[PDB]
Design a protein around this ligand. Structure first.
Ligand SMILES: Nc1ncnc2c1ncn2[C@@H]1O[C@H](COP(=O)(O)OP(=O)(O)O)[C@@H](O)[C@H]1O
Ligand code: BEF
Ligand SMILES: [Mg+2]
Ligand SMILES: [Zn+2]
Lengths: 417, 49, 417
RNA sequence: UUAAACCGGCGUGUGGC
DNA sequence: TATCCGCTCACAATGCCACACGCGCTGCTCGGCC
DNA sequence: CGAGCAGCTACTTGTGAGCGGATA
């Protein structure tokens, strides 16, 4: 009936369901076509459907409702919405519109939304009584979000490392600078699992850009919340499509006073995709980029801000370096000064199988006093000072050793003293 | 060009060009009077049509 | 009668056979025309034919059955199939359709398939009871495939090198980065012979792109399974034709829960061929490529995935570098991050006649714990660590020496200790 | 076998004799 | 089962000349043989 | 993919013969 209640179910289950509903065996069409035909048959039975979809507007004027499992892409399960609702409520991009729908007749392609029922888990009056994203006051990260899991595990290491190096807060803009083969994807998994198991009160939403399909499957069923991915089976156009989908969805959810955390990896890949989709302007700068080809990525990394009136938008994005090329280096230059949170993963310690390989030297936090209290900052500062004796390798040794003997932050602090 | 067995055709009526087949394989005067390997049309003038 | 039973026989044998069947001496027509006329005569005798062919669909709607020895190309021995069977069973591209056929009359060109008998070595019900390729869950390589032969030969070297550097598993995506004159073709032969002699349980299928005809003959009668090649006597159109043939055949065979290994060499040649076949879009990027001219190669390299429910698809592809041009370098950039398995062949050690020239530094394996067990990983890691003292040349010396004194992996491990 | 040259059907309306 | 009587349809309407013109968009169906 | 198929004219006049026709 609903979309996700059929999409979180496997393809064989949907085939069996469609065959149970008395239909042409749907194991020949794709899963999206399977659900489309199942909905068409259910609507033929003599009833309406109750659908849900995130909203997209093109230069035409009407609205498209993309689904979750489709990674916010174009498909037959996308619901059509007449522009009349957009003229009524001014529904911008990023509404999980939930409402009643009817089957399409000949000459049509998608289901038509009759009436609105749910606007981003809120009353449709919020569609007419709310505040836009460009008008509020962006602030610094006020709330402190603990990263350590609390079981003393071997991957807890990574979390507690960050906790004693640079914590994460609501409304932060985190950029990870790491060469290839530094343990990026398991770091994403570790930090996401910790933030979702320790703090289920905050909402997670992970973005994957240019990964392997097995990586997509390992990400999608392992972390909580929506797992949006955009792999190589789609061109840079669909890359920017899903990117703009998720950014406007996060913007609207923040407007709805919600805490939205966006993991992103990596930024250089989406920058290349954008360079691919934007035409030239007659001139080519260093690395092979354009003039406006940086405006999209800039905006995309800077949409992060802390909303002091309600909700927040935090982003944790990784970057690619040591690729041999120039464009990645200039992109890192442009994005290393725009973020309000910078962290670095070393490769020399990574290739020695000593993980995690944090750069305790280049790690930093913008205005950390709003993220760390009195004696909390005392402890963090004195430990930074005692680690300050010039060290990368045996500094990682000291950190990992004193972190493996201990379970929590206070244990480490009160055993080192 | 004409269809294989449509209203307009070559192997049924004749070549659309003087001493030129539809595929262009046989175009000289030595092959005048022989059919090709796929269409099988006697290459000749358009008057035959 | 059947196709391959006549095609694996030489041309003189087919000429003698056709002359024995009481026919116009067929030494004047090509071998494909010889077999076509022989089949036509056998059907004139008063009986039906039993043919087999891999399936192709164009925008028209009917189906073409290409043969094995034809390298999946267009020819008179390709069987015609009415679109009715495609409407019935939805036979996509990549079925070795085996069935009954009749001779073509006037107005026709190829034999017509009457009824279906064998659908990818399975019952035609599998044509209606199966799962598509885009719907399953791609995973990592679980199974471990040994590469060493086990005779202590001088080319066993190459295999065991890889075995102690980066093994190969079912569902892997291997990319070899090698400059010209590095020993590519004999490496392909060595690894294929080892995987086919040590593990006949797994199925092999080798792809050759832009090689010499003598190389085609040396590849076709030396390794097991189907040896598909596409040399320069065909344009880039037929290049992409045979490429799409073999990829959809592998996809369907994997859907049939079969292990399919695809050797490919090289990727830059097929990328150039694709750039040749795709029209421009008004803009030209670095190296002289298009926007969508990378989508075909991307897909082609990323079709590899491990199917945990049954069957698997592994690819071992070589790439070209140090060609002086740019397009090959950008292609290597695009394909070095998309693969889940990267290996490098050096040229400086190759030109010193010290083979094989593995880059033990840049060699790697994505998520190798699923490919290597407890003490297995212990041994591999400690040997990587003791080889880690910065070395290319005398590192190759140490490897080749300790590999030439020894016969198996465990011998090396227990003699080095 | 070779060389040269080449490669308005219909209907309607208007007006005039 | 004859004998007009009338209903109903086919067939036709100079020859030339000169000029001009337009003989359409989009949804649906069908064809299944490069 | 092509092609097609199609939804989106009307008081002539006469002259003639073929066909009811009806009616005792
Ligand atoms: N926290 C960690 N603990 C243990 N091993 C790690 C950790 N982080 C990374 N590694 C090792 O480093 C490798 C990084 O894997 P890969 O995905 O290829 O690179 P990246 O994650 O940097 O893209 C993994 O194979 C893993 O074995
Ligand atoms: F997964 Be790697 F960082 F490309
Ligand atoms: Mg990664
Ligand atoms: Zn011809």
């Amino acid at each position: 009936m609903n979309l996700t209640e059929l999409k979180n179910t496997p393809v064989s289950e949907l085939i069996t369901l469609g065959e149970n509903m008395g239909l042409e065996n749907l194991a020949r069409m794709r899963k999206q076509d399977i659900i489309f035909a199942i909905l068409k048959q259910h609507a033929k039975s003599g009833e309406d459907i109750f659908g849900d979809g995130v909203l997209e507007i093109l230069q035409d004027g009407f609205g498209f409702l993309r689904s979750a499992d489709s990674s916010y892409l174009a498909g037959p399960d996308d619901i059509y919405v007449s522009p009349s609702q957009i003229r009524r409520f001014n529904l911008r991009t990023g509404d999980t519109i939930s409402g009643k729908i009817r089957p399409p007749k000949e000459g049509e392609r998608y289901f038509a939304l009759l009436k609105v029922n749910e606007v981003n888990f809120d009353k449709p009056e919020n569609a007419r009584n709310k505040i836009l994203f460009e008008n509020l006051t962006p602030l610094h990260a006020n709330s402190r979000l603990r990263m350590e899991r609390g079981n003393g595990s071997t991957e807890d290491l990574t979390a507690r490392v960050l906790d004693l190096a640079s914590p994460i807060g609501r409304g932060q803009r985190g950029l990870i600078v790491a060469p290839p083969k530094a343990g990026k994807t398991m770091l994403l998994q570790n930090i996401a699992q910790s933030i979702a198991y320790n703090h289920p009160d905050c909402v997670l939403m992970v973005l994957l850009i240019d990964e392997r399909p097995e990586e997509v499957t390992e990400m999608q069923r392992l972390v909580k919340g929506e797992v949006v991915a955009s792999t190589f089976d789609e061109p840079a156009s669909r890359h920017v499509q899903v990117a703009e989908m998720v950014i406007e969805k996060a913007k609207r959810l923040v407007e709805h006073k919600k805490d939205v955390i966006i993991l992103l990896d990596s930024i250089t890949r989406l920058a290349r995709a954008y360079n691919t989709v934007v035409p030239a302007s007659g001139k080519v700068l260093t690395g092979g980029v354009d003039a406006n080809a940086l405006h999209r990525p800039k905006r995309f990394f800077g949409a992060a801000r802390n909303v002091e009136e309600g909700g927040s938008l935090t982003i944790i994005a990784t970057a690619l370096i040591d690729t041999g090329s120039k464009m990645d280096e200039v992109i890192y230059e442009e994005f290393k000064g725009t973020g309000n949170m910078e962290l670095h993963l070393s490769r020399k310690i990574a290739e020695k199988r000593v993980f995690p390989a944090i750069d305790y030297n280049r790690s930093g936090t913008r205005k950390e006093e709003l993220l760390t209290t009195q004696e909390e900052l005392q402890k963090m500062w004195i430990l930074r000072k005692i680690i300050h004796p010039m060290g990368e390798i045996d500094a990682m040794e000291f950190l990992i050793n004193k972190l493996a003997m201990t379970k929590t932050n206070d244990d480490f602090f009160e055993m080192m003293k | 060009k004409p269809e294989r067995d449509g209203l307009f055709c070559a192997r049924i009526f004749g070549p659309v060009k003087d001493y030129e087949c539809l595929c262009g394989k046989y175009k000289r005067l030595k092959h005048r009077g022989v059919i090709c390997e796929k269409c099988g049309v006697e290459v000749t003038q358009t008057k035959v049509r």
